């Protein structure tokens, strides 16, 4: 049941599936790329555990988790295509 | 037996995903002693050749590299008459995430693109640098003479 | 590879994106494998610099020694601080392969 994996493959910030999963390396907590990048625009704390990143530019401590993305795409078939479609709808409406 | 376990996994991986133009496996049921075969790469002057190698795994594999040498004589600036191979990843640059599959592929790339500024056979490196035609000619000749 | 300011720059799509609202384990072989022992990850430890994953025992044995580099991508591992346990990856593994 795809539902059973939700806790390990969803974003603590937006509660949806992890999209371009991005890891805060100091505490190894992972979020959508957009979610964590935008959070860091006015905070230095991990949104999950509150651990403060020590660099002036918190983006220095981010890494894309490509392995996790591939696992998520295999656990949630169709997700890869749904997000590409979602993006396509945006550009078609704005372009 | 962690080394033996690792070697066995590699064997299974090779059966599932063999490296292009290469094969390898135990000689007569000694898991720590393998033979490999490399078909001469198409791009290279070794084209058509069949090249045999011997592989000896150490007891603490994969944390120490395997010993890999050619048993087929070959005209190449980085491989000598003992069949010893000058290849970074076999010595100074080994890593425990490497496997025989990856080593064979690197050797193929070495056959395609020699490193004359890190040789084992000076005269061959000299010839490769200063006269490619002659290097190709003799490479091909040695391939017909030894790599049946 | 790319400058930091490029890597994390969000597209116009990404600046307005909304959540994506919430089969056989065999196909996950590569993703769950330890690059050192070639078996499924146990007691996962993950490099801070490159997010490469190894069994605790595997990477510890490798580092000592060693060259003090990530076995997968060769990046320097400045210290003991350079690795950290990944319990969430272990739990995901456990849900994929229950005991
Ligand atoms: Zn999110
Ligand atoms: Zn955290
Ligand atoms: Zn391992
Ligand atoms: Zn790495």
């Amino acid at each position: 049941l795809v539902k059973d994996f939700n806790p390990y493959i969803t974003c603590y910030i937006c509660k949806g599936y992890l999209i371009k999963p991005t890891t805060v390396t100091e505490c190894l907590h992972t979020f959508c790329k957009t979610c964590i990048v935008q959070h860091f625009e006015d905070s230095n704390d991990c949104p999950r555990c509150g651990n403060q990143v020590h660099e002036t530019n918190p983006l220095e401590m981010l890494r894309l988790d490509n392995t996790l993305e591939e696992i998520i795409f295999k656990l949630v078939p169709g997700l890869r295509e749904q997000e590409l479609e979602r993006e396509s709808e945006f550009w078609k409406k704005n372009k | 037996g962690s080394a033996l376990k690792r070697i066995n996994k590699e064997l299974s991986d090779l059966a599932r995903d063999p490296p292009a133009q290469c094969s390898a496996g135990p000689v007569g049921d000694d898991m720590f002693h393998w033979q490999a075969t490399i078909m001469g790469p198409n791009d290279s002057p070794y084209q058509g050749g069949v090249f045999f190698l011997t592989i000896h795994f150490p007891t603490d594999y994969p944390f120490k590299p395997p010993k890999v040498a050619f048993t087929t004589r070959i005209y190449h600036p980085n491989i000598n008459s003992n069949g010893s191979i000058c290849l970074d990843i076999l010595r100074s640059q080994w890593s425990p995430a490497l496997t025989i599959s990856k080593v064979l592929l690197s050797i193929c790339s070495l056959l395609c693109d020699p490193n004359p500024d890190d040789p084992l056979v000076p005269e061959i490196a000299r010839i490769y640098k200063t006269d490619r035609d002659k290097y190709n000619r003799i490479s091909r000749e040695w391939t017909q003479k030894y790599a049946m | 590879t790319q400058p930091l300011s490029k890597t994390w720059e969000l597209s116009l799509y990404e600046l307005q994106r909304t959540p994506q609202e919430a089969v056989s384990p065999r196909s996950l072989h590569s993703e769950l494998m330890c690059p050192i022992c070639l078996d499924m990850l146990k007691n996962t430890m993950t490099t801070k610099e490159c997010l490469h994953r190894f069994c605790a025992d595997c990477i510890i044995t490798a580092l000592r020694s060693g060259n003090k580099e990530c076995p997968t991508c060769r990046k320097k591992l400045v210290s003991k601080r350079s690795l950290r346990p990944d319990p969430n990856f272990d739990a995901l593994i456990s849900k994929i392969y229950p005991s």
Side-chain angles (χ1 to χ4, degrees), chain A residues 2 4-95, chain B residues 1-28 30-42 44-63 65-66 68-122 124-128 130-148, chain C residues 2-63 65-67 69-75 77-79 82-99:
Chain A
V2 194
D4 307 334
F5 295 97
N6 290 345
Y8 318 87
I9 67 182
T10 58
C11 180
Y12 185 74
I13 292 162
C14 67
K15 312 299 184 193
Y17 289 120
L18 288 164
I19 296 303
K20 295 180 184 310
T22 296
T23 302
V24 177
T25 53
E26 295 292 329
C27 56
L28 281 185
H29 286 133
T30 308
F31 313 93
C32 300
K33 174 182 71 169
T34 63
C35 297
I36 189 61
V37 165
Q38 295 196 296
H39 174 75
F40 271 167
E41 283 178 12
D42 47 25
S43 178
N44 261 46
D45 303 337
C46 168
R48 186 190 291 264
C49 78
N51 190 248
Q52 192 197 42
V53 153
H54 293 266
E55 299 312 286
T56 27
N57 182 1
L59 304 175
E60 190 186 320
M61 298 290 90
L62 292 182
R63 298 296 190 273
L64 290 174
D65 197 341
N66 306 278
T67 299
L68 194 51
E69 183 177 57
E70 298 174 310
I71 293 177
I72 294 165
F73 285 164
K74 288 177 186 203
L75 288 181
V76 189
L79 181 61
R80 185 182 62 243
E81 294 81 359
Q82 286 150 3
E83 180 55 17
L84 284 170
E85 178 61 14
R86 183 81 66 84
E87 181 166 5
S88 178
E89 296 164 352
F90 172 79
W91 294 110
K92 198 157 57 174
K93 192 190 319 139
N94 303 286
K95 232 165 166 44
Chain B
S2 65
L4 182 54
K5 220 200 302 182
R6 218 275 197 155
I7 291 163
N8 272 108
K9 280 291 186 46
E10 281 194 63
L11 251 190
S12 310
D13 282 7
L14 283 173
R16 178 184 286 144
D17 193 17
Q21 298 194 70
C22 302
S23 71
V27 170
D30 184 356
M31 299 298 313
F32 285 82
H33 301 126
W34 289 17
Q35 185 175 238
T37 306
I38 291 174
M39 300 302 182
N42 290 326
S44 81
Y46 308 104
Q47 192 176 5
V50 176
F51 299 87
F52 290 92
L53 311 94
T54 183
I55 296 165
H56 295 92
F57 297 98
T59 54
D60 51 357
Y61 189 71
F63 303 97
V68 179
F70 277 77
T71 54
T72 303
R73 284 209 59 93
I74 180 178
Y75 189 79
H76 193 291
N78 302 121
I79 312 176
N80 68 23
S81 50
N82 290 330
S84 187
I85 310 167
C86 193
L87 189 59
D88 278 354
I89 55 149
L90 285 181
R91 294 182 179 85
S92 40
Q93 288 296 279
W94 173 261
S95 147
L98 299 188
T99 62
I100 297 302
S101 176
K102 295 169 179 310
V103 163
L104 294 176
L105 293 185
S106 297
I107 296 174
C108 292
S109 168
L110 186 60
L111 291 199
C112 283
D113 283 272
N115 297 338
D117 305 282
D118 196 344
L120 267 185
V121 187
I124 299 180
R126 194 188 86 265
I127 288 182
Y128 179 87
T130 55
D131 184 13
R132 191 68 55 91
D133 283 26
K134 181 175 184 182
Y135 156 81
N136 288 340
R137 182 177 58 73
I138 301 173
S139 286
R140 287 193 281 279
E141 292 172 354
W142 284 36
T143 297
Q144 291 300 279
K145 186 174 182 185
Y146 301 116
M148 297 82 74
Chain C
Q2 295 292 337
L4 205 52
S5 56
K6 171 63 175 185
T7 300
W8 304 112
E9 170 189 83
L10 303 179
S11 71
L12 295 186
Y13 166 71
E14 289 171 326
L15 295 175
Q16 58 83 68
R17 68 165 286 265
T18 46
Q20 285 287 348
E21 305 260 286
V23 297
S24 175
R26 284 186 282 259
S27 80
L28 296 165
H29 179 98
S30 276
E31 294 80 358
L32 311 176
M33 185 181 74
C34 169
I36 296 168
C37 66
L38 308 178
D39 201 3
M40 185 158 72
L41 286 159
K42 301 191 291 278
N43 309 121
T44 304
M45 293 268 280
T46 306
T47 56
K48 290 189 184 318
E49 166 70 28
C50 34
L51 287 184
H52 288 138
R53 292 174 167 99
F54 309 89
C55 310
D57 297 345
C58 291
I59 189 65
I60 297 180
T61 297
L63 289 184
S65 171
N67 299 350
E69 73 196 1
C70 172
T72 295
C73 74
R74 307 290 183 138
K75 250 133 178 183
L77 295 191
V78 306
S79 139
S82 288
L83 281 166
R84 178 163 185 93
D86 200 337
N88 293 327
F89 205 81
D90 287 332
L92 170 55
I93 290 189
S94 188
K95 283 289 300 183
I96 288 162
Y97 286 103
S99 3

